[PDB]
Amino acid sequence: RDNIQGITKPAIRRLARRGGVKRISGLIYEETRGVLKVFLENVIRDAVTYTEHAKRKTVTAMDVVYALKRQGRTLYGFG
Amino acid sequence: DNIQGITKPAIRRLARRGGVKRISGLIYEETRGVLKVFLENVIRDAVTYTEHAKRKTVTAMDVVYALKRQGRTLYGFGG
Amino acid sequence: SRKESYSIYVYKVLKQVHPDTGISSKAMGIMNSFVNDIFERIAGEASRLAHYNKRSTITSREIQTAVRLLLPGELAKHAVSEGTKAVTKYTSA
Amino acid sequence: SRKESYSIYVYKVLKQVHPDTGISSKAMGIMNSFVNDIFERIAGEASRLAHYNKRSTITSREIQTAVRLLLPGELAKHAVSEGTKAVTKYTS
Amino acid sequence: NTYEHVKISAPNEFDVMFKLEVPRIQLEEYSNTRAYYFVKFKRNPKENPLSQFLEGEILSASKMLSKFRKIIKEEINDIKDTDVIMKRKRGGSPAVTLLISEKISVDITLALESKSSWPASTQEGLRIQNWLSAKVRKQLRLKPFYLVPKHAKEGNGFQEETWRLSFSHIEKEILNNHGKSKTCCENKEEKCCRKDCLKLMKYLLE
Amino acid sequence: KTRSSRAGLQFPVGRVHRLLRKGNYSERVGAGAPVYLAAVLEYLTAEILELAGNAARDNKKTRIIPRHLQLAIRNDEELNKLLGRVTIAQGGVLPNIQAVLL
Amino acid sequence: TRSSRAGLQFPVGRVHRLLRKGNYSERVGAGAPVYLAAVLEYLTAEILELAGNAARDNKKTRIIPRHLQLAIRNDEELNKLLGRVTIAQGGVLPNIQAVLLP
Amino acid sequence: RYRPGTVALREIRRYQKSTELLIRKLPFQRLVREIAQDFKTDLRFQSSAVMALQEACEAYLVGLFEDTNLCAIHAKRVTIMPKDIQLARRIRGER
Amino acid sequence: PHRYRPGTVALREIRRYQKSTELLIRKLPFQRLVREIAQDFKTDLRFQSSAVMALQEACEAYLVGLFEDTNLCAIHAKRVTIMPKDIQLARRIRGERA
DNA sequence: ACAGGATGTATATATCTGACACGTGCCTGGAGACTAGGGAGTAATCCCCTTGGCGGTTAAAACGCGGGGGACAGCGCGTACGTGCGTTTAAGCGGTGCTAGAGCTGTCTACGACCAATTGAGCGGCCTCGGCACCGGGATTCTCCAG
DNA sequence: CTGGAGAATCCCGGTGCCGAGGCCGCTCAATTGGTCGTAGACAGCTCTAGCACCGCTTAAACGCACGTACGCGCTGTCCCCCGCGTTTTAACCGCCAAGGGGATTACTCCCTAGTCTCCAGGCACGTGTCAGATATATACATCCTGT
């Protein structure tokens, strides 16, 4: 608990300014926090599945890369 | 022509299946454009499959694989 | 020359779970395309799993992992349960 | 052990295009994973395509049609032209 | 933006160069002449209208200069109280001679500017390493190059669509920084004669 | 003594084993894997046909048509999130009327 | 070598080994890895060309993933190719909406 | 005379229940042959391929009309606009 | 008091963070969140640090693309200020909520 | 509309500094041949099914007219958030330490490849009966002027 | 603003027609049974390397007044779009060819698989120095308020 609260308000504001957003409502922050928690639940579920398949105890970068591969959200730079 | 063969009330019937209550008069030409682009893509890939099989008769299954690789998977015709 | 679909197998499953329910031929083709789609999904996922761990042998563990990836939560849980049960049956017999 | 990367080949293509330009290791990782991704996509679609015609031999025609299906229009046309030129040069 | 006194013995004649921002261009060298290249727009998805004007795959320099002259002749008529007339285009040169009403002969030459990498024959050149620095060499290498036409005038070559490279801006920038010491002709201990002797040689030749 | 009957299943262990062999998925196919995969396919087929049969009973018909397959997949949230990318021909959509229009 | 024999830069032999190892099919034709290494060479050449041109436009002589991001996302056809793909260490396009400006 | 929208909602209740093709077969098929004639001349079509491609095009447009209607409700309107369609395709990523 | 208008500093922040490329989320709370959710799934999983970096890259790029689509929704509704209904709309069109 | 004091960003200037670029040593996978078979090519063929045309038939497209409700602009104004100022937090970073577990290396073993016989489950054709499409009249569902 | 008026819609129920259910006969593919290597299971031991920890630091998170600017509410306006009519269009359904082209078998023979052997390219390990980020002063770009 409360590590999800570690996603701060000005961090979301920095992401919005990178996203080109001019003004930000006060309820944007908890919504973004929940959406990021859902996205992370999906990716970490896939990563834990890859890790437990590998009979290992250490999550590695390649497992996260293949998790994002089956997500469709394909990332480069870590393989 | 055939882009006018996509009639105004056929687009209105498609929108009523979609649930649209009120339609502007400029919706129709834009819908013709979007439909034309989508069929350009699908028929492009399907004719590419047809040319690969050294054939001049576009099967259903080639259209199925074109729609599959675009990500719009259709069931019930071959695969 | 033999179009081998899953028609009689799906029909056996249909008369197993609903003996008073019919099925059209178009719906049978849809279920055939469905089974081929899910088979391609799980088989490609397990193939890539075999290439990740550098094993040349797909076993039930790889299919278990691919099912846990491809399906959503409780469906995957019930499916892993059914598969483990059936592999236990095939091992005991 | 040994790693299988495309780093020196990306660097050779870079010296062919931009002969006095640097590239970071992270950008080299980007391009290594990119080349593995494009190789994986094209080899997979060639495998699917050969499976569609039940052929057990991936040919250059298979790769050509895989490029035509996967890659978007004008870039695919240029790439098919380059690949056909290179295969004809290989045959001689 | 290079006021380019090529003719310092008579500054009343101008050679005003125009730039044109082009896409990336595959270059085909002509006949191993080592300076005459063909302009082929390698690949462009935006479909910029220069490619729409082009013939085949090589950009037609004669077509470009013809319609350029056509637009100039058409538009300089519209100039009021400044007598600008279309002078003869003869001499097998860029031409587009325009006279501004009293001996102000302006020879307009539009130049393509590709911001791409330098061609392979321009590699061992720019030998300002021991003169300025290798770093200034590499930073001037990062600057864009230019394209001006001339048909290959080798005996029988006529109206060929070749393109030779221009280097005017790098030469102006090294005329603004010409000493090994970076404050040359800037403080009163390093008055040199590079600009002096260069103007002496160019005036003597002209 | 067939392997489908040996495991007590419905989907063909021999056909799945043959497709895993000749489908070039790996060099070796362990013998429990087609059993496991046929079991998973049997459960998925049973679940979807259960929901499609319930859709047919809700329309009071004793024959599943593609409309019932569409309604069954798009009503179950787990199978819809599984099959959101799949369009069924002659499927239609769910009854989905916007409350702001009423 | 076959790369020298095809006049190409990418290793055709490594592509042939990976086609044999990756189990895409059993038999691999001889012109297939030649054609594939050519397509990889053209794609790598065009993307590094755009990246180096953007690096010259930002006056950087070392290619970082920012220039790769800008190069791919400024070509609309490459953007159509790689719309789903995330480049790490990339940032985004400089893109300001016209309603925001005064 | 009905309220302007009552028989529209009656049509919505009709066509969400219905499954059949709403585009007329032969103008659509002639359109498909014209678009294919743009790519490669003198091509022959299986009629099942034309029907399946019509299924895919109608289902794609129904999804697009749902998301476009959601956008138009989101802007507190009930009238859909080409601006709405451009928004929907820009979010989907098709342009 | 040299106070700007309420849009100007927003515009220079847009120029700065579209110019910048670094990680905007602070690394250690993101690591705590990842370790929290993974501990919820499988207890005592050690992490590769580059895997956490890749997770942060994917999350930040996903949220930036989401905020672009959210800004397009908010400008589309004749507004300038984003609201969580814009985010719900964008994820419903992408297909995450429906 | 125009000038003025900020305020931030870009350009030039030493100084690092860790990572590219280039040499060096190894070593296994490509290369060069050599063979065997088997997939793929080609010829030639059955036969499906597309293309086209036509007649008739009717649901539907197109146009017209009345009008009305929502899009759009404007007035208004209340608050929510940006801007700014001041105030604690804790991320980050280097730094060392402990051991958990990946990774390598070698040592076996049950398991699939492989072949080969043996036969049923599976498919192609074949009847055959209930389920789906209408078509009018009951029964329901539902919007629309007024005292 | 509640009741009645009437136009439309969902079952009732007969008709009827036609596609799923179901055997029957043929037959390739599944199942059974040895043999083999060898990939995978297992053990052991290194040793990277991930987790905890300090402790200083300082941007950065956090809070708060506040004016303003944008959201939303209200107000009228109007035309653009809904609905019913009134006409015409042409899609559709069925028939009926003519032939293009898909599918199949039948021989074939090249092309890749496979085996062998040698190399030289590819990778690991140094290292020199080069792009970049550092600060730091300075200049060019952009606002915000009074006349």
PDB file of C-alpha atoms in Angstrom, chain B residues 4-76:
ATOM      1  CA  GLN B   4     -22.061   7.279 -54.750  1.00  0.00           C
ATOM      2  CA  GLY B   5     -23.359   3.708 -54.834  1.00  0.00           C
ATOM      3  CA  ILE B   6     -22.663   3.841 -51.133  1.00  0.00           C
ATOM      4  CA  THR B   7     -25.856   5.762 -50.577  1.00  0.00           C
ATOM      5  CA  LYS B   8     -26.814   8.257 -47.901  1.00  0.00           C
ATOM      6  CA  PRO B   9     -29.531   6.050 -46.272  1.00  0.00           C
ATOM      7  CA  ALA B  10     -27.254   2.999 -46.274  1.00  0.00           C
ATOM      8  CA  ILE B  11     -24.794   4.989 -44.163  1.00  0.00           C
ATOM      9  CA  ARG B  12     -27.780   6.075 -42.096  1.00  0.00           C
ATOM     10  CA  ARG B  13     -28.824   2.434 -41.623  1.00  0.00           C
ATOM     11  CA  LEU B  14     -25.278   1.573 -40.549  1.00  0.00           C
ATOM     12  CA  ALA B  15     -25.338   4.451 -38.064  1.00  0.00           C
ATOM     13  CA  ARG B  16     -28.729   3.364 -36.726  1.00  0.00           C
ATOM     14  CA  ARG B  17     -27.265  -0.092 -36.179  1.00  0.00           C
ATOM     15  CA  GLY B  18     -24.431   1.694 -34.419  1.00  0.00           C
ATOM     16  CA  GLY B  19     -26.961   3.733 -32.472  1.00  0.00           C
ATOM     17  CA  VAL B  20     -26.532   7.249 -33.863  1.00  0.00           C
ATOM     18  CA  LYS B  21     -29.536   9.482 -33.207  1.00  0.00           C
ATOM     19  CA  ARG B  22     -28.627  12.437 -35.412  1.00  0.00           C
ATOM     20  CA  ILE B  23     -26.431  12.671 -38.499  1.00  0.00           C
ATOM     21  CA  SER B  24     -24.977  15.699 -40.252  1.00  0.00           C
ATOM     22  CA  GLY B  25     -25.144  16.044 -44.018  1.00  0.00           C
ATOM     23  CA  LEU B  26     -21.364  16.006 -44.354  1.00  0.00           C
ATOM     24  CA  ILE B  27     -21.007  12.682 -42.525  1.00  0.00           C
ATOM     25  CA  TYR B  28     -21.818  10.801 -45.716  1.00  0.00           C
ATOM     26  CA  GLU B  29     -18.946  12.007 -47.894  1.00  0.00           C
ATOM     27  CA  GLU B  30     -16.469  11.495 -45.056  1.00  0.00           C
ATOM     28  CA  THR B  31     -17.865   7.997 -44.557  1.00  0.00           C
ATOM     29  CA  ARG B  32     -17.324   7.349 -48.255  1.00  0.00           C
ATOM     30  CA  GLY B  33     -13.715   8.431 -47.833  1.00  0.00           C
ATOM     31  CA  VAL B  34     -13.098   6.243 -44.775  1.00  0.00           C
ATOM     32  CA  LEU B  35     -14.779   3.242 -46.400  1.00  0.00           C
ATOM     33  CA  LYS B  36     -12.728   3.788 -49.541  1.00  0.00           C
ATOM     34  CA  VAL B  37      -9.470   3.911 -47.559  1.00  0.00           C
ATOM     35  CA  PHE B  38     -10.344   0.767 -45.600  1.00  0.00           C
ATOM     36  CA  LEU B  39     -11.231  -1.163 -48.726  1.00  0.00           C
ATOM     37  CA  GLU B  40      -8.075   0.083 -50.459  1.00  0.00           C
ATOM     38  CA  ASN B  41      -6.026  -1.435 -47.648  1.00  0.00           C
ATOM     39  CA  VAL B  42      -7.929  -4.722 -47.396  1.00  0.00           C
ATOM     40  CA  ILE B  43      -8.138  -5.302 -51.148  1.00  0.00           C
ATOM     41  CA  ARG B  44      -4.456  -4.340 -51.468  1.00  0.00           C
ATOM     42  CA  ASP B  45      -3.359  -7.073 -49.095  1.00  0.00           C
ATOM     43  CA  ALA B  46      -5.884  -9.595 -50.438  1.00  0.00           C
ATOM     44  CA  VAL B  47      -4.772  -9.063 -54.036  1.00  0.00           C
ATOM     45  CA  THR B  48      -1.191  -9.426 -52.783  1.00  0.00           C
ATOM     46  CA  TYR B  49      -2.115 -12.849 -51.370  1.00  0.00           C
ATOM     47  CA  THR B  50      -3.840 -13.650 -54.657  1.00  0.00           C
ATOM     48  CA  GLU B  51      -0.783 -12.716 -56.720  1.00  0.00           C
ATOM     49  CA  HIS B  52       1.340 -14.866 -54.435  1.00  0.00           C
ATOM     50  CA  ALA B  53      -0.712 -17.946 -55.210  1.00  0.00           C
ATOM     51  CA  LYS B  54      -0.151 -17.251 -58.959  1.00  0.00           C
ATOM     52  CA  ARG B  55      -3.914 -16.989 -59.302  1.00  0.00           C
ATOM     53  CA  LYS B  56      -6.420 -14.507 -60.678  1.00  0.00           C
ATOM     54  CA  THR B  57      -9.375 -15.534 -58.489  1.00  0.00           C
ATOM     55  CA  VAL B  58      -9.417 -13.865 -55.069  1.00  0.00           C
ATOM     56  CA  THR B  59     -10.493 -16.503 -52.562  1.00  0.00           C
ATOM     57  CA  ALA B  60     -12.252 -15.832 -49.288  1.00  0.00           C
ATOM     58  CA  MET B  61      -9.328 -17.191 -47.271  1.00  0.00           C
ATOM     59  CA  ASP B  62      -6.964 -14.596 -48.710  1.00  0.00           C
ATOM     60  CA  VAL B  63      -9.333 -11.876 -47.518  1.00  0.00           C
ATOM     61  CA  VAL B  64      -9.361 -13.646 -44.152  1.00  0.00           C
ATOM     62  CA  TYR B  65      -5.582 -13.568 -43.919  1.00  0.00           C
ATOM     63  CA  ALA B  66      -5.429  -9.920 -44.998  1.00  0.00           C
ATOM     64  CA  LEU B  67      -7.960  -8.977 -42.326  1.00  0.00           C
ATOM     65  CA  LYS B  68      -6.046 -11.162 -39.872  1.00  0.00           C
ATOM     66  CA  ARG B  69      -2.768  -9.366 -40.437  1.00  0.00           C
ATOM     67  CA  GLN B  70      -4.482  -6.008 -40.203  1.00  0.00           C
ATOM     68  CA  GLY B  71      -5.807  -7.156 -36.837  1.00  0.00           C
ATOM     69  CA  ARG B  72      -9.503  -7.413 -37.718  1.00  0.00           C
ATOM     70  CA  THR B  73      -9.946 -11.149 -37.425  1.00  0.00           C
ATOM     71  CA  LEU B  74     -13.057 -12.592 -39.069  1.00  0.00           C
ATOM     72  CA  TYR B  75     -14.254 -16.112 -38.291  1.00  0.00           C
ATOM     73  CA  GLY B  76     -16.158 -18.555 -40.423  1.00  0.00           C
TER      74      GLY B  76
END
